[PDB]
């Protein structure tokens, strides 16, 4: 099932804060292609951000036994 952790910069008028409540997200999906499509649609729909302005920098699978947030742990 490969819980993924996607990190990157999204833009609205020179906006960059690489930490954990205005910059990046967590995703649970089979492969990397599925996880990226989720990030584009969720940020593009909820914040009106086109895909020009979303710059994904790091995507990597994290182990299910160590996640800071318990919301993504509970559906495992």
Contact footprint for RNA (CB under 7 A): 11, 13, 52-53
Distance of closest approach, residue 57 Cβ to RNA, in angstroms: 15
Distance of closest approach, residue 16 Cβ to RNA, in angstroms: 12
Whose Cβ is closer to RNA: residue 13's or residue 19's? 13
Distance of closest approach, residue 49 Cβ to RNA, in angstroms: 9
* Percent of the chain that is helix, strand, coil (3-state, to 5): 30, 25, 45
Two tokens, residue 58: 């790091």
Cβ neighbours around 68 below 10 Å, total: 8
């Amino acid at each position: 099932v490969k819980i993924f952790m996607v990190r990157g910069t999204a833009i609205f008028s020179a906006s960059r804060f690489p930490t954990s409540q205005k910059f990046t997200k967590y995703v649970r999906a089979l492969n990397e292609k599925q996880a990226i499509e989720y990030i584009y649609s969720q940020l593009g729909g909820k914040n009106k951000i086109k895909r020009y302005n979303i710059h994904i920098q790091e995507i990597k699978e994290v182990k299910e036994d160590e996640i800071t947030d318990k919301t993504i742990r509970d559906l495992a």
